[PDB]
Amino acid sequence: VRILIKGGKVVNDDCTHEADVYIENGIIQQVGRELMIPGGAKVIDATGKLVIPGGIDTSTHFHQTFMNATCVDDFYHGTKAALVGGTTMIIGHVLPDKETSLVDAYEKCRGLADPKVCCDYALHVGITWWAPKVKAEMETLVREKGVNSFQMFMTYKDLYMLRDSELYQVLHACKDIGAIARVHAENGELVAEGAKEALDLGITGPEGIEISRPEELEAEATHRVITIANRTHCPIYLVNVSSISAGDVIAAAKMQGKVVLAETTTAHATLTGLHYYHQDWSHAAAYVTVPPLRLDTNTSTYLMSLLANDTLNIVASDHRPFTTKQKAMGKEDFTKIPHGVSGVQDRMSVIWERGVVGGKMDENRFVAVTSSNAAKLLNLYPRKGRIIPGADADVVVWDPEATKTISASTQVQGGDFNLYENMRCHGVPLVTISRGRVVYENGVFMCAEGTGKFCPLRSFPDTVYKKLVQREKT
Amino acid sequence: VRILIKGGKVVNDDCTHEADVYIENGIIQQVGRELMIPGGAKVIDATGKLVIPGGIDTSTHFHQTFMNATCVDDFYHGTKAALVGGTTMIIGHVLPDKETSLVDAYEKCRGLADPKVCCDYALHVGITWWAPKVKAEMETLVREKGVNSFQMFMTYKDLYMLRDSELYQVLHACKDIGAIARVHAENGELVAEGAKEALDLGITGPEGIEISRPEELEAEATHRVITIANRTHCPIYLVNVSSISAGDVIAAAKMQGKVVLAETTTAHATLTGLHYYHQDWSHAAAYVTVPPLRLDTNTSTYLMSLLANDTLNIVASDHRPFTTKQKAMGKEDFTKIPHGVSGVQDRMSVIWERGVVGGKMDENRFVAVTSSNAAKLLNLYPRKGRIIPGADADVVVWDPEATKTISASTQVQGGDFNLYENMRCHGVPLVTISRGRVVYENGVFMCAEGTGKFCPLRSFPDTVYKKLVQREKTL
Amino acid sequence: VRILIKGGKVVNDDCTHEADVYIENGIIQQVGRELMIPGGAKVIDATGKLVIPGGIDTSTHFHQTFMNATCVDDFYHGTKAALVGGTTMIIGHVLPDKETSLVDAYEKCRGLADPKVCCDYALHVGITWWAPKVKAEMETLVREKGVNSFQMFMTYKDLYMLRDSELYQVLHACKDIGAIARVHAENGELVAEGAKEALDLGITGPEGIEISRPEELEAEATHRVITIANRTHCPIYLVNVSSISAGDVIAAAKMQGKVVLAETTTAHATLTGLHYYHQDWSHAAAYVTVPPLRLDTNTSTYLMSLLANDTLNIVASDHRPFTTKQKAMGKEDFTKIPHGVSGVQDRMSVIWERGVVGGKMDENRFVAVTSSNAAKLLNLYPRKGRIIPGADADVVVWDPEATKTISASTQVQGGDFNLYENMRCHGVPLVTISRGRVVYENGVFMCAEGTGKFCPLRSFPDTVYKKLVQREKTL
Amino acid sequence: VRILIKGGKVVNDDCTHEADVYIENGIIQQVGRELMIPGGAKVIDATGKLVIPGGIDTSTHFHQTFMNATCVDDFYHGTKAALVGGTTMIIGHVLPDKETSLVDAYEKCRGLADPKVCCDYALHVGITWWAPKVKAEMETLVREKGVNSFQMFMTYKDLYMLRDSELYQVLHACKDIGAIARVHAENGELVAEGAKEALDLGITGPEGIEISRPEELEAEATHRVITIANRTHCPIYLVNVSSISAGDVIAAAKMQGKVVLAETTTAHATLTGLHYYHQDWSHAAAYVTVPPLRLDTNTSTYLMSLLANDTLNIVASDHRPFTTKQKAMGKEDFTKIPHGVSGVQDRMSVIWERGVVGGKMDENRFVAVTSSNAAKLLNLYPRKGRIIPGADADVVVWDPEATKTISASTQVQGGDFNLYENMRCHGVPLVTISRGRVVYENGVFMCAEGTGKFCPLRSFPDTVYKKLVQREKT
């Protein structure tokens, strides 16, 4: 399959230039103004369009059972939805139950994904308890199974939560093997007490998700894990950053030279918690995730600014849709509403609209936060996240002058609601190319299940570790 | 005993005015310009002097056995040193070991203090472990043993440290019975790992106390306990605040309306951690306390500004002297150097010198940080911490033109070193009056052991709790 | 006139206690529990009530002509409204035009006020231009006309604005004569350009007042004047603090030990700029003042926390009401809407409701922000701002269980709107006493015009300057 | 001239990879692992070396008369010194006297530089007063004379200082033509009063430079000009940032999405004001510049962290050496010591040593702050600041395992002192290539005067303006 993308502007995270792109055998072969190529190529007319690295979504939960509900999208449907939305790689989550094997949970995931994915992928592994067995398994995963990133929780007391002593040991273990420590930082003791107290106060509706875990619980846990990480000399990556208070902690730490990276989600960057107070229970429940969307109307604008200014590095969907019927497990008790929202298909368009069209960042910074920063952290740059010769041919022809009104009735991602219903969004993937084949064009998707491949992720990504390895020389 | 303090300026925390003060039967009877009094009063000449409430020292450790050493000063010597240095009330610590009775520990302390104290006193009670028996003991102490303040530690893993879940319950229990929760906020897991790591690196000298617990450990724990307290709705009182980082956390919280109070020590407000690097091991060890003094040379100036600005409310000595021989338990392993410094006799003069003479605060703010704020928090204001009619006659005649230079060779407090050696002090107590008797005058102390009394401390002090009643209606 | 206030709780800024208060010849003679007094005193029943120092309102504009409109309330009506609302002292503004005499302007004000005031008063003097004649007039005012506070503006380009070089000299001159420098800190060049730009964009409605001067203009000017004051060593007092951004600058400065004080208005501490977008033009215009109320809904809560935390020291009304007809001068051009709102009668009740009932501060902090801090800054403490023997008898019997709802239809202050329309207030003055006479009781005001007196204000108030003496020795 | 650089690692601001580089006719022709090239090329053995974009020094003052002293380095000697130190482009300053023509001052500079420069260069133009004539001249310079950057001062009352009203008009004028506004932000009224007061207090020694302009004067002016710029919608570029207080202002503004960029100097990033108290007057005077080095021992470490974290974008030398004899004009009155220090030759090595070796940033971030960020701001990226095919052949073979001890006795830059005397610095330019010729190798410099060329700088650099032009669409 030989593809010539003609007439567009190549947009990488560093700059934009007019150039044609020639793809063959899964790889970008040439980029330049006037290309000499063999005849017979599929020609895509990208006049007026931007030719960008396909999106890399660093947080997705295809096929995951969580809080007794099973995500509506499996690996085929999730990756299809990602491609239609202009994302060409997904990183999925493995979440072993406490005191169960990390490797078994990883293998189960590999089995669900390998025969089904439409696009390239890799996996983060959840560290949900600690013991010498767990440490050995971390070493195995990094050495043999193409993992370089672990996910920890400071919340979910009695299910997934790690205590300070255990985080210390975890982070020490991650740095010794060159892994990235992702952490969900909310104070789990206080979250547990807050939910019990909210229920006692008769707050049983979805707004309990906000009331029971005010932002100071995030700011506190964020401060604490950054301190633990600085003492262990481990790089720390905060996830689902949701609040001004937490953002301010991260910015203060970075100011002091601490080795801190952070991700937010589309929803936290663009939506407010007023959705929890909607008159329709089902609408309100669809927005329930953690940390929750905050009521302060300035929060989404602030987080967008931080994404533009590199206080936050990366934006992910955190895609974990449930049906209305599954969400309704919590109809009489908000603590049982399963945490999760839809977004894998929405991410690129929503961030283009609120970020770029809204004047918060430019097109190059859009590429950085949707693909290039992630590729770097993943140790896959410039194989991914960059339009250059030699890179993987994961490419999106992006129409910056098309709008689509977003609606659940027209989406292919799972869920009964779309969080961005009726939003007019001015940026559209016109063509999605994955592994050097057109998989989405003229509004039609086509790609066989299992076409995508697992991409092993190598330890010690320079973007983080070159600096750290140098500090420890003294 | 009838006393007339004539010719001075009365300095309270609100303002200064020229007035005489007449005392009888332990109580200030009159304050005013041309007083009509029965003849035969002892007349003290205070012309050129300031008449101030006696110092209230909210943290002292007389007779305490800690880290295998027992504090040099008992309740007689400690309270005498206090009085000579212009402090007329001390609050002592009780520290029951894990799984042992709080009441028994409090009773033992009362037994050691009641016959020995020279000045009024009360006691904080340490909460070092948690269980239903502990909660019942807290209730007993507040309901009938005159306690209204508990001390907890987020550090000293496996000795005194409470875990986060325990601290939540402890703070709920404190606010239910109207107590103040004092907390020593350093991250105890990180302190434990830092010390181990420092030793493994061959850092065994006194500077290990700094290296092993950098200020981020105090800032993190300070932030965490403020957050816990906010969720429990308990007033929270941070102790031994040592760092810019921690002070900034406290200020950011107060900005947000959180119910946060904070104390620092004389040493933290005036000295730097350079002392840990002194060529004499014994000198360095004498400065070892926790959180440690910080190397950042701006630290003491900043903490003094916060005391002036009311980000920090109160200055204490945290008096817990040990000898060089005792300190030498750690000569080859800094983690065994027992934590504690001398200061109960130095506090008023040193804070006067660095605070008032240094231009960071005026004489009225000096009274607030040395007596009045403490009296309010203890529920003893204006009985203490104010020169007014009706108040207890705990009064100091303070000379703001003094010729003193501090030296260990002339102090009466315990310890082989004085942290402030050779410091020139312009403010000193000329006369100390406690319970309406002169106990120190013309450089001579006289007071019989056991003259001081325990002062039961009433729960739900208004200065903290009156606000909290209305605040609760909105939460 | 002899008055006995019996059965109440005395609430000063330090603490609350049950006590009776006996007044004679304009002065509080006794405070205490079972008072021995001559018979035939007027007895006021204060059981269930709080006895507080009367309010001191540090910013009022009675009789002022401003922006081509003349304030609805003169000195009689303004002071009557004050007294009905529980405020017993007002500080008025003098504002001489550029190149005109400060003294003549002060004398004219004294002429308008002396025969009309119902309560005690004093005056701030505006410094709107600079030259040797001005410096000589400042000196005259402080040396013999009882002024100790000057007001300057960093905005109103070409009307009242001082340039940076002039402000430096003005502040040096103020600290030399021991005055307090009040400053309205918005960037006047940017305010001028913002207004022009807003009009050019067709923004002509009242919301222009917000759009044209966003909070960064106040934060920038606030930072700049603090910096100027620090270099001149002059105490600096920020007025009408309106924003989170400005408040954060002030707090950051105080953290650094700068000599900074700050006032806000009732409206800024309680209301938002949403009022500018009201469908009735007249309603929107009634809220127009500078700096404007801010749209950020967290603003008033934050400023109230700063008042509770002492980042802000004092709350004033800034009373300058205009009618709807006067305000309508700007119906087609918001820049001509004269700046000013009603509030002198509302201040005590509104701050009680949002401050004390809201749980942001307690009753004692309420006294500090409404009288005591002002008395200190004015050099009138404890003559005013404290219920003690010897103090002036300016006293309010305050009912903390009141049934009032605020409405313009029942107010006695001027203006067609009341900013707080329909607000339920639990705290109201039952009795107001001024100069030791009852002037308001049983809902009836009675006081003859001119009963109030000018109170000369002495230079170098200790609360600011006593520190500065020692600080100067280190600089 | 045909050059093959073989065996090294190409280090750009985004990543490092092993690759050979082939240069011909002033331009990088190929980059790649195994190159097919015509025979007869000059071969440089870069095994063990890093192949980097040559340094771009955005602030130099060759031939400038300032404070009645004339800089010791002219355009030949300055640019030679730059090349020996691994900097291949310099941006010089034009500073018209108040009420004199901007264009005449630019033309005089062009005349001094064109026949003398050894390396490529361009010029910033000082706006030292304001009137309608000045605005017309700005338009001319941008339209016709290859200027896109103006330098303003908030200090030097009565010589160069602009007042608030004049800055407003200046910044409005700069944004309308797509220029960058560089500003030296110290409060000039307060600086003037502070120097008068210091002298009155009998402080006449070099330490007066600190005492008379404490950091709050910078923080205040920095806050103010950022506010002016935000109101005018003009990009603002702070220069010679020197203090924690000012850095904190810049970081707070960036957090809020304001369009703020900032530069520091080598000396501010690495040295403290204790040098003002040296026992030798001449040593102390050599460090006198503005804003002054600060006494707070944490300042240089903090500013280095900010350079690593992108609070500060760019590091320049601000090279303006004077002799001991010229500095001594201020022997009895510090206010007459002419402001200026040597550094053009030191910059790359000092920042490599303190930045990279000290573990504050990695090698890629070193390239960003020494060349790539500047190229972007200058509208010259990726022509400069990047090793890629098509880029200008301005390249340095950098030895990361060589130390040189810095000493004035061995430098080629001007001045009697070197601020970094005796510093052991572990990174060395082994080879400097400018315009595709070797100009420095085996420790020997060779390049004819006038070989370098003026590089016109085009208006509206995307890195700043693409975002801004979008904001003003609403």
Side-chain angles (χ1 to χ4, degrees), chain B residues 11 15-16 362-364, chain C residues 460-471:
Chain B
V11 179
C15 66
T16 295
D362 62 37
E363 63 195 8
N364 309 102
Chain C
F460 293 96
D462 268 356
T463 192
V464 174
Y465 280 94
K466 198 156 56 179
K467 186 184 302 76
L468 272 165
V469 166
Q470 277 314 108
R471 181 192 170 90

Side-chain angles (χ1 to χ4, degrees), chain D residues 301-314:
Chain D
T301 318
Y302 164 92
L303 295 176
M304 192 66 76
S305 302
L306 301 197
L307 197 54
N309 79 38
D310 207 41
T311 301
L312 303 174
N313 305 102
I314 288 169

Side-chain angles (χ1 to χ4, degrees), chain A residues 13-16 247-248 251 254-257 302 305-306 308-311 356-364 376 381-382 386 462-464 466-468 470-471 474, chain D residues 13-16 247-248 251 254-257 302 305-306 308-311 356-364 376 381-382 386 462-464 466-468 470-471 474:
Chain A
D13 73 326
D14 61 330
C15 65
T16 298
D248 290 341
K254 290 177 117 132
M255 287 288 277
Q256 298 176 314
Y302 164 92
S305 302
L306 301 197
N309 79 38
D310 207 41
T311 301
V356 179
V357 176
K360 306 316 173 46
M361 64 180 77
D362 64 35
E363 62 192 9
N364 306 103
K376 286 173 180 177
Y381 181 89
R386 196 167 180 77
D462 269 359
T463 193
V464 175
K466 204 150 53 179
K467 189 164 63 292
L468 273 164
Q470 186 58 27
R471 293 186 180 185
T474 40
Chain D
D13 73 326
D14 61 330
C15 65
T16 298
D248 290 341
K254 290 177 117 132
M255 287 288 277
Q256 298 176 314
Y302 164 92
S305 302
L306 301 197
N309 79 38
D310 207 41
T311 301
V356 179
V357 176
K360 306 316 173 46
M361 64 180 77
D362 64 35
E363 62 192 9
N364 306 103
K376 286 173 180 177
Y381 181 89
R386 196 167 180 77
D462 269 359
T463 193
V464 175
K466 204 150 53 179
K467 189 164 63 292
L468 273 164
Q470 186 58 27
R471 293 186 180 185
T474 40

Side-chain angles (χ1 to χ4, degrees), chain C residues 78-92:
Chain C
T79 58
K80 164 174 175 185
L83 286 161
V84 170
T87 285
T88 53
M89 187 177 188
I90 62 95
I91 313 299

